[PDB]
Ligand binder design. Structure first.
Ligand SMILES: Cc1cc2nc3c(=O)[nH]c(=O)nc-3n(C[C@H](O)[C@H](O)[C@H](O)COP(=O)(O)O)c2cc1C
Ligand SMILES: Cc1cc2nc3c(=O)[nH]c(=O)nc-3n(C[C@H](O)[C@H](O)[C@H](O)COP(=O)(O)O)c2cc1C
Ligand SMILES: Cc1cc2nc3c(=O)[nH]c(=O)nc-3n(C[C@H](O)[C@H](O)[C@H](O)COP(=O)(O)O)c2cc1C
Ligand SMILES: Cc1cc2nc3c(=O)[nH]c(=O)nc-3n(C[C@H](O)[C@H](O)[C@H](O)COP(=O)(O)O)c2cc1C
Lengths: 335, 335, 334, 335
């Protein structure tokens, strides 16, 4: 299958084209520490043959968590514990990625120091965010850098910057949430500035031979917000600094959209073609058939599975055509 | 499901977006007559919920058969027998189409008059075809007209002209097979002439309120042959005369191509968008998931299933979410 | 698969162990005649690879129909139309069976002569049946024989006597519905008399080298009714005269029944072992896996599929491991 | 489903009727220690909703291993590590069992002290076992007792005595392998003596409120060996001392057995009915349909899955009809 073809990005070789999409498990301590639940959860999909396991949103500051049961990488003590996830997944044959995240105004911890580009709530249940100063923005850029340094110490192969789903970076990118009139607002170049500074600071702290991904929301599904043309312009600003765009949509504000298998694939293909950059496709993909169509028609370079890998952790094993491709311990169960 | 949305074309309403792709059954007598095998074969998929059943290649001249077990519509006697297929499929809720065909140089009958645009074999296992005179070309154009007249008398709802898969019309369209220096060759307008004349003659013999489809091969997969750019030009020449392009590829000469699910879908989408015409997609589509993605992402207007409907004739019924959508006799078998 | 092993019964060889269970389609006209709907319906499962297609309940008298859209074989004019079903199914590789039936007190036609062993309704919605005389019982026996004669003329390979599902013969077999005090009631031998007579009259009209099946309800799920031990007794009375027992349950009266895959298989196994006779198992079987277990554990000789073959007509084709087992027209889809 | 009904045995409640059959993973050290591969392996099936996880054959002494990558429980160091498996499986909702084993003459370790009841090989590739003295038999009985003591310290809920598959206890039970003329041979009561002594010693070391299972081979498939009637006799000797018979077959000598789904179910039903004891069925069972048939027709009290749980670890989750039955982390994947 084309899904079984390797993809080399810088010095990292991913053995197949399936990525486990980053999915929060809301199972960490309030100190952001992983536990045996995470270790088993990720190892299971490594065992199941996933090429690239992207760890769930891991907060670069405590106020950048979504919930107070999220994973963190805002301090050095978290490194030794996250390394346990990295080591077991790599031992079982996966490339390990980490999604570096900051929830911004969508931080749902009522007691946290919630921040954003402009003082507008994510919704009625949320705390009003403090409007960030330029000084504070610089400190958050620094925090992404330190998180990348820690990720490298923990042994992650790939870093992803979470610029999607209504969180901090997306909030700067969208005119619907960014009403700033300083150097981080108004013009498209200014709205992109925070993302660009984060990328630059991550690269200062990330080995040049390891890849950087960026996850984006390619559509806000709302007049005056991000649309595919706007996202194409943003990706063109950063394509010389990052390796692959993990293409999603939505999350900034509540919107009813049409959901169906592959509903975000056109965004992935459009970015891939217009920007000439590698992309990942995600969204209601569950079958080998659709995954193969996406890859073979060159609509994306990787296929990300989220919910399908929650219910069906060995999806990739079931696509193999010989028992020798299975874990030796499970060879006898090949059909 | 989007699959269950009707499609109206002229006065004909297809109840859903699934077409049974035309597939030769090689089960007729040497007289080209259908028999109980064909009647059951097609009726089964009408019962199974298929929106549009496209009858297999039905030869407009005896020398236009692929084999001497193909269906024919080259005489008036065949009409009464074909009507039996039409009536039973319509009785069971399907729209009935007929693929009007001429195999040209790919006719495999030893005792037939094998003809083509130029004296060039389809491959080293085929007969050298006899080069058609302009008078003979007019006679075949006439034969397509008479075939459409007969199809209307038999009660078909849709006619499809078979201009694909390396058969006669495709042979005129491709520079690899058409070496003529008269008005039927040596320019793109001249190579299109036969197709255009066939369409015009069919229209003279086909009610204005019934659709005309054309099946094409959008790619020869060979330098100098048809490619997507060339097929867009051909479709632009005919799009004001026909209702839907049934998009396929290959067949002209033996070529090794990459086969995978949806390997012809990009041609279908490309023709739909560049020519602003309805299209059907076909080729290794077997899942509801991929069918839904194709329709929802506006890559085609109909999804054609071939081999899946041979092995799984009730595929459409399995997509229904209510017992009242099933044939009353089988209601007790719903989930 | 054991599913693919032939079964020879008298001179008829069934190419595999899958039977299409008899299922009413309510698609005939009031004349009892089949039409193109039936022809396509059965032909489809023959193309789908079913070893033995058992045609739906086909009434041996017009008053023996369940509905007035049932198939009939109570007159000679029906033979040439039923033959159309037989010929196309055999042409496509299936052994063809017919379920000879009589609805008795469960006849749902308001204007028919609804008859039964005793004047007791099947339920609130049913007509009070007219209590049969001995002469009338003999006439119905004769009707079964004539129906078998017609079935042979139409070319059926197998005849099945429908002695189940609360219909006429079952009504004679169950103490719950048979309160007669003549030679057709009041002892197990007398309750079996009608069935035995029907079998004998069928044998006089059916070639000795073609199989006879009998479908039975092995449990009424009610105190005083048929139970597995009683059915074993009945089967031992007829086993020297028939070839296979098609084992089902229920239908005489409304009862709550626990439903699950294989819920009637224990009845099939018990009759098979305790009577030393071939059996078929039916009821909520949908998987190759369970079909194989039933056959390989010698719980039955055939597995009957009903609803699974309505929704999934090519079930058998999907069990083949080579394209040569498929219809040649469809080989490309293997 | 009937498979979702709890089964309470003594003070232990199994939440459903699915057992993970004991399966060697050949992944331990030569010191018989488990490692992270075992912990994840078993935990995965606990997460997957399995009611009772039966750990693989765990050797009561080193010469009782099948291979030198088997788990052992002959010392405290092993207990400390096995406890990690128990704890994570119980934390995720499973009852944890351990299969206490001794390979006897089928010990396949080239350097071990291979023992059996009589000096007869299991097959040409095996070593000739040395005939145990009555004193040595008593010491192996004591080893089973100490193993049960250790298993209780590790926190296992259920202890299973492995008396099947051609291993030590089975070798004493079968006339084909037991040619002894002392009190451990000849008569059926003497053949049963070792099994009976092992059960008695386990009971001295195992809490009275925790279940004891026994796995047996109910057929040797050879004239003069064990058959179902003989096994019924043995179970009648022990049924007042144990809680459930885990019914299997074969293993003593190589025999060409007819393999098919449910091929051992008749043995489980017969023991259940004739002995009035609970049983589990195992062997080529993969479908919900067959599992439900087995339980509903009262052929067994538990259904054990082996290879199906290797390839499809979340089998039980897929049977649930409500999202609330899923682990909370995965409830978004309920479909
Ligand atoms: C439980 C859950 C947690 C999620 N958490 C994250 C996350 O940390 N980061 C992220 O980028 N997307 C997250 N998402 C979105 C998924 O990664 C994925 O983009 C989305 O579910 C669409 O893919 P699917 O249809 O394959 O699940 C989450 C989704 C789910 C269901
Ligand atoms: C047995 C068989 C017969 C076919 N005959 C025809 C035909 O008469 N006309 C046609 O346009 N294509 C014919 N084809 C091609 C199919 O219509 C369809 O385009 C092709 O098989 C790809 O679709 P699938 O992958 O869904 O089968 C045939 C294919 C098969 C397998
Ligand atoms: C539509 C329908 C019609 C039926 N008609 C008959 C019939 O004519 N004769 C009969 O013996 N059983 C009849 N039954 C019962 C079936 O033959 C079969 O015994 C029952 O459906 C259980 O099997 P299944 O679970 O495979 O469907 C019918 C069932 C259905 C659903
Ligand atoms: C890899 C593997 C290891 C096994 N190890 C054991 C074992 O330790 N103890 C045991 O009683 N059976 C063992 N068996 C047998 C299984 O537990 C089970 O009885 C057998 O495979 C039939 O079940 P299945 O068809 O569901 O796999 C093993 C089977 C396999 C495939």
């Amino acid at each position: 299958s084309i899904l079984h073809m390797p993809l080399k990005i810088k010095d990292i070789t991913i053995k197949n084209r399936i990525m486990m999409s980053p999915m929060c498990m809301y199972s960490a301590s309030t100190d952001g520490m992983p536990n045996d639940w995470h270790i088993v959860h990720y190892a299971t999909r490594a065992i199941g043959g996933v090429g690239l396991i992207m760890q769930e949103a891991t907060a670069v500051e405590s106020r950048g968590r979504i919930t107070d049961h999220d994973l963190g990488i805002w301090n050095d003590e978290q490194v030794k514990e996250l390394k346990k996830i990295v080591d077991i997944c790599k031992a079982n044959g996966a490339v390990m990625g980490i999604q570096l995240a900051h929830a911004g105004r969508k931080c749902n911890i009522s007691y946290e120091d919630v921040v954003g580009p402009s003082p507008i709530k994510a919704g009625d249940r949320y705390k009003l965010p403090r409007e960030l100063s330029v000084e504070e923005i610089k400190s958050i850029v620094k925090a992404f850098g330190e998180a990348a340094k820690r990720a490298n110490l923990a042994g992650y192969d790939v870093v992803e910057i979470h610029a999607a789903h209504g969180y901090l970076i997306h909030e700067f990118l969208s005119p619907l949430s960014n009403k700033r009139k300083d150097e981080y607002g108004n013009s498209i170049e200014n709205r992109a500035r925070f993302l660009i500074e984060v990328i630059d600071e991550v690269r200062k702290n990330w080995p040049e031979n390891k890849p950087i991904f960026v996850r984006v929301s390619a559509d806000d599904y709302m007049e005056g917000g991000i649309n595919i043309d706007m996202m194409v312009e943003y990706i063109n600003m950063i394509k010389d600094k990052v390796d692959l765009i993990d293409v999603s949509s939505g999350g900034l504000l509540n919107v009813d959209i049409n959901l169906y298998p592959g509903y975000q694939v056109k965004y992935a293909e459009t970015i891939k073609k217009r920007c000439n950059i590698k992309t990942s496709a995600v969204g209601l993909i569950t079958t080998q058939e659709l995954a193969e169509e996406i890859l073979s028609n060159e609509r994306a370079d990787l296929v990300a599975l989220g919910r399908e890998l929650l219910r069906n952790p060995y999806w990739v094993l079931h696509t193999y055509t010989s028992k020798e491709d299975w874990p030796k311990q499970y060879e006898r169960a090949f059909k």
